């Protein structure tokens, strides 16, 4: 339905192939990770210079 993904459900897909070393792998994506329509980065760089540089 258009409710779980719209809610932001983080879906995951697992697959097992013989050729793979671990024999198992997976990926995942949610609403945001699904082509983020917009970022919300708010990084803060505290103490840009001190002791270390």
């Amino acid at each position: 339905s258009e409710e779980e993904w719209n809610t932001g459900e983080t879906y995951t897909c697992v697959v097992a192939h013989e050729a793979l070393p671990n024999r198992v792998t997976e990926r995942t994506v949610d609403k945001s990770t699904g082509k983020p329509t917009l970022y919300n980065v708010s990084l803060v760089m505290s103490d840009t210079a001190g002791t270390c540089y």
Partner: protein
């Protein structure tokens, strides 16, 4: 010359200050099922003593369930199998 070369946050300070901040990553690194933490903090003092990136030599892992014919069984899976070992 390179004072700090932390690979957890990719912070290199040659004394240059380079910091790469990958956007695509979940809040909790233990499992992907966590919010997307867009905030990023780089405390120089603390860094010179909650990671975001993944080291090239480091191969993380998480346990996940699987069900094919019988019962749900837990198996380990690597988030970066290429680093671990077309």
């Amino acid at each position: 010359i390179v004072l700090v070369d932390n690979k957890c946050k990719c912070a290199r300070i040659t004394s240059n200050i380079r910091i790469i901040v990958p956007l695509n990553n979940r809040e909790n690194i233990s499992d992907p099922t966590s919010p997307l933490r867009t905030r990023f903090v780089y405390h120089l003092s603390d860094l010179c003593k909650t990671c975001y990136t993944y080291d090239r030599n480091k191969c993380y892992t998480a346990v996940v369930p699987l069900v094919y014919g019988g019962e749900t069984k837990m198996v380990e899976t690597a988030l970066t199998p290429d680093a671990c070992y077309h």
